[PDB]
Structure 1
Amino acid sequence: APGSSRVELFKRQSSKVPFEKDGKVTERVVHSFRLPALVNVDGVMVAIADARYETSFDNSLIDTVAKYSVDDGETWETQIAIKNSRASSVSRVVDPTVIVKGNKLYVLVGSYNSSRSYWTSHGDARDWDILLAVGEVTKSTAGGKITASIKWGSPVSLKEFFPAEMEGMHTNQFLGGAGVAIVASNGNLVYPVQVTNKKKQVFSKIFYSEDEGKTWKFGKGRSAFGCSEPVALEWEGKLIINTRVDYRRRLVYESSDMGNTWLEAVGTLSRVWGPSPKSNQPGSQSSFTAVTIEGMRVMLFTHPLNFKGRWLRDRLNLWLTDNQRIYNVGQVSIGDENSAYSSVLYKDDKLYCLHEINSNEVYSLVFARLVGELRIIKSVLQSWKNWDSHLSSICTPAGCGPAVTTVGLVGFLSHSATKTEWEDAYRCVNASTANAERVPNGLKFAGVGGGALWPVSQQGQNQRYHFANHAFTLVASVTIHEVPKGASPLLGASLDSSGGKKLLGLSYDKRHQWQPIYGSTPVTPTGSWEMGKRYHVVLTMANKIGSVYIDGEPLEGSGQTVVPDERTPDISHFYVGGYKRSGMPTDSRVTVNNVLLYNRQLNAEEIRTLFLSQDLIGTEAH
């Protein structure tokens, strides 16, 4: 990332902290630093973490360290925010989870006295407490300089707020999800927490306070079992709770009622992010925040790619999303270093990341100035803004008719293309092409193997288009140049690598009829088409039903089940203008322009507007 730089701020086996025991304080070298949380309190940067004094092993001696800086991270002061009980050589305060409100740092930690096993394996709660400490940040301008100070109060146990029973089950322990939590728009302090029951299942809840931390409540709902280390933000009046699932894809939920109800975010972010290339390795803590960049509300998300496997968790990656498009900003860590946990802060229009580096299970936290990354982010955000503005600004055929909708518009294939790719105007997922000739606002295809392939599950580890398994609208303009020998494809969602098994699609045949394909149902040819005429094609799928529209009108027989109510589809890719498979004997001679993908089923007016504005939406002229 050109322009970016970093320092080893919390340096393993080197950085010292003020270790207090029985009224005596000694500057003490720390073996490992883990669990970064990086925040802004009134212009003061504060970096909170675990100081694992003797080893990186989880069940060992740990205090919560804080560093703070008034100069954007050039210099820092160092404190212990929270000390462990000092009961034993493995006493520890763990998983520090931070909320900023006003001048206050709320830090929630589990506290353990003597156990040498990880908390989820405990059969009881005898070794556990849950503590809240408050740090009060003040600033001084005495002497013509800015000086900050943080006064940490004594921790208070919140155990009294943990019910012995929850929706049936009996509770054992809970911890914060680590990293940075939030103040909701209603002022509530909101911690996503990870909780165990007596069956040793782990699940996520919302733990919240309506009275500045004095009392706490749990929402009655929960994630699925197996969801740990939850991280949350508030988006459009809802909490978005992004969870770690060891050995599986991350589950993401939305709750509008402080955790009383949880709905999997299948239409947006759930199941997008895999913990390793084959999504069969441990997960991670993640930074997940909502921020406003160049006037646009967006979300930033970090997770390692974990090519190495196990808990090594190399290749920390950064992602940008507006809850519609999902852009890979790139790799924050360096080379193949192990770099699991992280915390991203956007402050005074500068981007920073405090994150782990691990060699031989000795961990430092580096403090990175993400200059290259913010440059890419602003570029991408300007492209999103530009194209949304382009589409929204179009005076559609009436005065002007209804505006073309950009709500839920995820991808758009128009004029830009290279020799082997059709480029997404939204810059997230290009389509691969074969036997494609560039024409205004699209591509012309010919010959066996021709077409374009827009990957869905084929995206691999990180599946930005997973939403399509639940609902989508796929729109294009198509022109047929040659009468085919038999039924030939134009547009569709494939369930397998070849395109032979379809969820929903549209073909055309030698008798000048359309052949809409509804899942595995026998195909009934219908309607009529003419060579050389530009047709508007809309495929919609929602609530397991698929519809095919030509020139804004449903084909006779549209609105059929395409998904057996038991299973959830796993779309491989969308195919456009052919299958893009030389193993498929069809030869589609067609031009396709302006392909739009939405994460929802468009309504009647929206479809009609798109049909009527086909000649106006191309990116060529702009």
Structure 2
Amino acid sequence: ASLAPGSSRVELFKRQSSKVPFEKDGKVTERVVHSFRLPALVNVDGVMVAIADARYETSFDNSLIDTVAKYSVDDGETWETQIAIKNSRASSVSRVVDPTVIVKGNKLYVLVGSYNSSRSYWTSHGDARDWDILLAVGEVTKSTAGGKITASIKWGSPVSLKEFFPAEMEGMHTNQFLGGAGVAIVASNGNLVYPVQVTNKKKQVFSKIFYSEDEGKTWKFGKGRSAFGCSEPVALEWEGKLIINTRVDYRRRLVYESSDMGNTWLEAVGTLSRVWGPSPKSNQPGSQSSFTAVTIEGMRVMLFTHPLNFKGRWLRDRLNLWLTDNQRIYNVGQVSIGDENSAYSSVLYKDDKLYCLHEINSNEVYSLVFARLVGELRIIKSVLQSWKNWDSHLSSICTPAGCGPAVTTVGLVGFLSHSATKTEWEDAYRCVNASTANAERVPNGLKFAGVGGGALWPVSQQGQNQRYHFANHAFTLVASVTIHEVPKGASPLLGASLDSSGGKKLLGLSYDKRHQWQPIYGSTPVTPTGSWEMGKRYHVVLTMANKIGSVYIDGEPLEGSGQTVVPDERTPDISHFYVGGYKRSGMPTDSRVTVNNVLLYNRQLNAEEIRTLFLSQDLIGTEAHM
């Protein structure tokens, strides 16, 4: 893929070409840089600022590095270059590393680890003999040169914050810590907040919250932490909580939420945790990620980037952009070009303009290109228009009492309704479509029939990035159904499957030749219950929360519903939801049924919300508006 139409870029920090003002021995010389890495792009009072690593001689992490900075007043049309922080010059490999930036006022708060002579990766160090943690502040000043506007950043001498690092943390002895790289934040209470990666004497890595209530003079660590294995954390604030997105090498990315500045950390199992995989099989090294909360056209949202890493190891090709409102998760597309190597990145939203500063690597020689995400922001605005519209549409429906409670759109992730192509049932939220077989389009839905007939809404089948991972912890699946033929035995209607066939179910609804419902609770022996008549329309709700599954028909629980569907302590790994058959020609069954308006929620709905959905089933369809 490549940049969306209308978008373009330029190699801003050009490898082995761009020069910087390297200072040594009171002298200063324009020195060429082999590699530029660790991109951090921010907006300071109108000034666009780009911070990064200046790796003078090699791209090897443990070499000579200073923190470079280029700034613009014309939004990337022209840039001034400087060195924001120079390393100790103690050896040929002295360096200030992984700059992490926070903008507050006309101030740049830059946190970097500092090493003097070690040629070993920081996480392999057994002690802090070679380490320090420094904070440098750059103050921005705008003015006018030849009639036109100009600016200048004055950089302060870095200050050691090592005095704020406790020798002990709950059950361990501290070693070193660094910022999470990229861009950090100012909390809504004013606090400077840096998600930091810390090591202990057992050489384990884990993330913590390192914050300041006094503009940067003193610092504290939240009492809590992530699990071990969580590095380069990146955080944002969302609805009064910090959402900390972590890199986990060779594993799916863990995401945590903290309401108390890091004293307690809860994994975001019902929203973003384990959604993003570091590679197709999530068995390769991860990456630093841009993760920010922006307000586009009135709507608060989060932007996330990470490479797909098809190539493997650290190559990390295909830098992708994601959009989420903490409910739906949309893949905006690929920001890097073709299959170039593009790991670390930084996305900025400034004056309704979207930009990205990210790495491009060829033979371990890095450059930072500066891209104008024009087509991308177009797509983003459009998708948000779609979410706002469908939410407004559903919320404005006057439900049967003059009106009863409004249809709930809180936690509504996907909706399969009128729109369907020959092979796909389309998500009105435009994030995840369902694949189909033997389906005939009908108002607000599809009519199925035949061995192999049905629809498949992927969960673990989505692949590397699993937007419906939350379903393994809780969900509500809703649908209107009509059975056209009494089955020979027991046929599937709606369900959450644990395997690819649909034979190993988590929670499901089947119907049998004796006109009874067959709710399936995990691998528990089935017991038919209730009755139905052929050709009659029914309303079905499947919910799961607290390892318990329930099945409702026409708004009411079936007898004996509410059983444990998650047997032990291992978390489910739902493969997909099946609707109107298994969509597997390999399953014998034949479901002749019509299913309309399938809704997917990331929580268990309550009795009233279930009641309103039932009464309102003929009002929610997308049909009239396409």
Same fold (TM over 0.5): yes
For 1:611-622, list aligned pairs within 5 A.
Answer: 611-622=614-625
Partner Cα separation in structure 2 for residue 531 and residue 346 of structure 1: 55
Report the alpha carbon displacement of residue 372 of structure 1 after superposing the two structures with TM.
1.0
Partner Cα separation in structure 1 for residue 80 and residue 502 of structure 2: 60
Q: 3-state DSSP class of the match of 1:567? A: coil
1:497 aligns with 2:500: yes
> What is the CA deviation profile of residues 269-306 of structure 1, one whole-angstrom value per residue up to 9, with x for unaligned ones?
00000000010000000000000111100000000000
1:151 corresponds to which residue? 154
Contact 1:544 1:565 in 2 (8 A): no
1:571 corresponds to which residue? 574
- In structure 1, stretches of 5+ residues that fail to align are none
Partner Cα separation in structure 2 for residue 514 and residue 169 of structure 1: 55
Partner Cα separation in structure 2 for residue 54 and residue 141 of structure 1: 37
Contact 1:192 1:231 in 2 (8 A): yes
**Normalising to structure 1: TM-score of the pair?**
1.00
> What is the CA deviation profile of residues 314-356 of structure 1, one whole-angstrom value per residue up to 9, with x for unaligned ones?
0000000000000000000000100000000000001000000
For 1:61-460, list aligned pairs within 5 A.
Answer: 61-141=64-144, 143-460=146-463
Instruction: Choose which of 33, 37, 40 in structure 2 pairs with 1:37.
Output: 40
Q: 3-state DSSP class of the match of 1:621? A: helix
> What is the CA deviation profile of residues 501-526 of structure 1, one whole-angstrom value per residue up to 9, with x for unaligned ones?
10000000101000000001111100
Shifted more, 558-567 versus 343-352: the winner is: 558-567
Contact 1:120 1:200 in 2 (8 A): yes
Partner Cα separation in structure 1 for residue 564 and residue 270 of structure 2: 19
Q: 3-state DSSP class of the match of 1:116? A: coil
Report the alpha carbon displacement of residue 59 of structure 1 after superposing the two structures with TM.
0.1
Partner Cα separation in structure 1 for residue 169 and residue 79 of structure 2: 43
* Runs of 4+ off more than 6 Å: none
> What is the CA deviation profile of residues 76-134 of structure 1, one whole-angstrom value per residue up to 9, with x for unaligned ones?
00000000000001000000000000010000000000000000000110100000000
Partner Cα separation in structure 2 for residue 142 and residue 577 of structure 1: 69
Partner Cα separation in structure 1 for residue 51 and residue 222 of structure 2: 27
Partner Cα separation in structure 2 for residue 587 and residue 223 of structure 1: 48
> What is the CA deviation profile of residues 539-566 of structure 1, one whole-angstrom value per residue up to 9, with x for unaligned ones?
0000000000000000000010000231
Q: 3-state DSSP class of the match of 1:260? A: coil
Partner Cα separation in structure 1 for residue 266 and residue 253 of structure 2: 14
Partner Cα separation in structure 1 for residue 521 and residue 155 of structure 2: 63
Report the alpha carbon displacement of residue 532 of structure 1 after superposing the two structures with TM.
1.3
Partner Cα separation in structure 1 for residue 344 and residue 122 of structure 2: 19
Partner Cα separation in structure 2 for residue 314 and residue 608 of structure 1: 48
Contact 1:290 1:297 in 2 (8 A): yes
Report the alpha carbon displacement of residue 144 of structure 1 after superposing the two structures with TM.
2.3
> What is the CA deviation profile of residues 375-429 of structure 1, one whole-angstrom value per residue up to 9, with x for unaligned ones?
1111111111111011001000011110000000000000000000000000000
> What is the CA deviation profile of residues 185-226 of structure 1, one whole-angstrom value per residue up to 9, with x for unaligned ones?
000000000000000000000000000000000001000000
> What is the CA deviation profile of residues 163-192 of structure 1, one whole-angstrom value per residue up to 9, with x for unaligned ones?
000002000000000000000000000000
Identity %: 100
Report the alpha carbon displacement of residue 143 of structure 1 after superposing the two structures with TM.
4.2
Q: 3-state DSSP class of the match of 1:380? A: helix
Report the alpha carbon displacement of residue 585 of structure 1 after superposing the two structures with TM.
0.6
Partner Cα separation in structure 2 for residue 497 and residue 45 of structure 1: 49
Partner Cα separation in structure 1 for residue 91 and residue 328 of structure 2: 49
Partner Cα separation in structure 2 for residue 258 and residue 379 of structure 1: 34
Report the alpha carbon displacement of residue 490 of structure 1 after superposing the two structures with TM.
0.3
Report the alpha carbon displacement of residue 308 of structure 1 after superposing the two structures with TM.
0.3
Instruction: Choose which of 472, 480, 485 in structure 2 pairs with 1:482.
Output: 485
Partner Cα separation in structure 1 for residue 249 and residue 445 of structure 2: 42
Report the alpha carbon displacement of residue 141 of structure 1 after superposing the two structures with TM.
2.9
Contact 1:277 1:307 in 2 (8 A): yes
Q: 3-state DSSP class of the match of 1:144? A: coil
Report the alpha carbon displacement of residue 142 of structure 1 after superposing the two structures with TM.
5.0
Q: 3-state DSSP class of the match of 2:624? A: coil
> What is the CA deviation profile of residues 243-269 of structure 1, one whole-angstrom value per residue up to 9, with x for unaligned ones?
000000000000000100000000000
Contact 1:420 1:432 in 2 (8 A): yes
> What is the CA deviation profile of residues 595-621 of structure 1, one whole-angstrom value per residue up to 9, with x for unaligned ones?
000000000000000000000000001
Q: 3-state DSSP class of the match of 1:389? A: helix
Contact 1:448 1:582 in 2 (8 A): yes
Partner Cα separation in structure 1 for residue 430 and residue 34 of structure 2: 42
Change (3 A) 1:57 1:142: closer
Partner Cα separation in structure 2 for residue 199 and residue 255 of structure 1: 26
Partner Cα separation in structure 2 for residue 452 and residue 128 of structure 1: 56
Contact 1:108 1:131 in 2 (8 A): yes
Partner Cα separation in structure 2 for residue 520 and residue 207 of structure 1: 46
Contact 1:544 1:562 in 2 (8 A): yes
Q: 3-state DSSP class of the match of 2:384? A: helix
Q: 3-state DSSP class of the match of 2:146? A: helix
Report the alpha carbon displacement of residue 592 of structure 1 after superposing the two structures with TM.
0.2
- Aligned residue pairs: how many? 622
Q: 3-state DSSP class of the match of 1:231? A: strand
Partner Cα separation in structure 2 for residue 456 and residue 527 of structure 1: 30
Q: 3-state DSSP class of the match of 1:396? A: coil
Q: 3-state DSSP class of the match of 1:170? A: strand
